[PDB]
Scaffold this active site. Sequence first.
Site, PDB file in Angstrom:
ATOM      1  N   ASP A 112       0.757  -1.186  -0.004  1.00  0.00           N
ATOM      2  CA  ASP A 112       0.060  -0.009  -0.009  1.00  0.00           C
ATOM      3  C   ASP A 112       0.952   1.300  -0.098  1.00  0.00           C
ATOM      4  OD1 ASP A 112      -1.999   2.038   0.456  1.00  0.00           O
ATOM      5  OD2 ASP A 112      -2.336   1.559   2.217  1.00  0.00           O
TER       6      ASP A 112
ATOM      7  N   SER B 298      -0.357  15.751 -12.174  1.00  0.00           N
ATOM      8  CA  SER B 298      -0.654  15.302 -13.487  1.00  0.00           C
ATOM      9  C   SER B 298      -1.018  16.448 -14.198  1.00  0.00           C
ATOM     10  CB  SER B 298      -1.946  14.448 -13.473  1.00  0.00           C
ATOM     11  OG  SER B 298      -2.312  14.173 -14.744  1.00  0.00           O
TER      12      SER B 298
END
Length: 330
Positions: free
Chosen positions: A35, A199
């Site tokens: 994770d 992004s």
Amino acid sequence: STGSATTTPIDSLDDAYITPVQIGTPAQTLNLDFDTGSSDLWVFSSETTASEVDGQTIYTPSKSTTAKLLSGATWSISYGDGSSSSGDVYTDTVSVGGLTVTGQAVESAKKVSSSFTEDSTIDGLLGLAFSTLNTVSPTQQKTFFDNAKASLDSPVFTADLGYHAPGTYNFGFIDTTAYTGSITYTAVSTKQGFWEWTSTGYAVGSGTFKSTSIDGIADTGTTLLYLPATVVSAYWAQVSGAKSSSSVGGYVFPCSATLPSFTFGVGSARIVIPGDYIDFGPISTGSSSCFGGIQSSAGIGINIFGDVALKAAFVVFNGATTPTLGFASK
């Protein structure tokens, strides 16, 4: 040193991925959920409340000759989906894919929430976010990657998640045969303890690319792609019959639909998520309503590049002094 381990979807939807991990002496092999959005290595154990264990493999520290109680230490964590676990702490030898850390904090669950009990395939979590998020008290502990770092050939690990198939976690090296083209690296903020990046925009299907900054985290422990409501609406508008259902808890679409791809920007580069990756199947057995793999982050407080996004790429988690993230197509 290096390590290399195969990671395997837990079910036919890729709801999560499990990776075998060796704990203790002799080795006890548990299948852990790696994770990159948390920083605790915790396991089902011989200490876990019996009514809360249902089919998982447990760690038994008393059977390990290298296990040592970390005296006074406790832990307690809650995740974004409302699940939780807590317990006490041992140090022990932990190996992943041939890479061995001695003195790793292994957090033994005394309690786990029902979500964990109900998932027979996951024996615990192995956190790969920054150690500043680790919940051990009163002495915060280091992640497996943090402990291994100095010994690694290069201070990196990579995630190569498969679509409906196994993939690979590598530690200490970049497999140049595992991706196409070049890797594009992008800046990371560690200020919130995550692999947080920006992004450069998105496209829906064959649509034009929208240049827009989207801050988010690279999180292998989250199933879906959670983006701003504007972006998510733009995607699902291209799917006949798709709608946001408050009763179901997100966007659903007719199972008869063909989904468009979704593209996200990494610098000047582009990662394409095929439409099929965005299908998470009937909301309930036999339903003709299907659950979407792109969902709104509104009310989460952060955008999450979860497995839907990450499995479309070869992803480098670069833990150099100034951490960065790299993405390649594959």
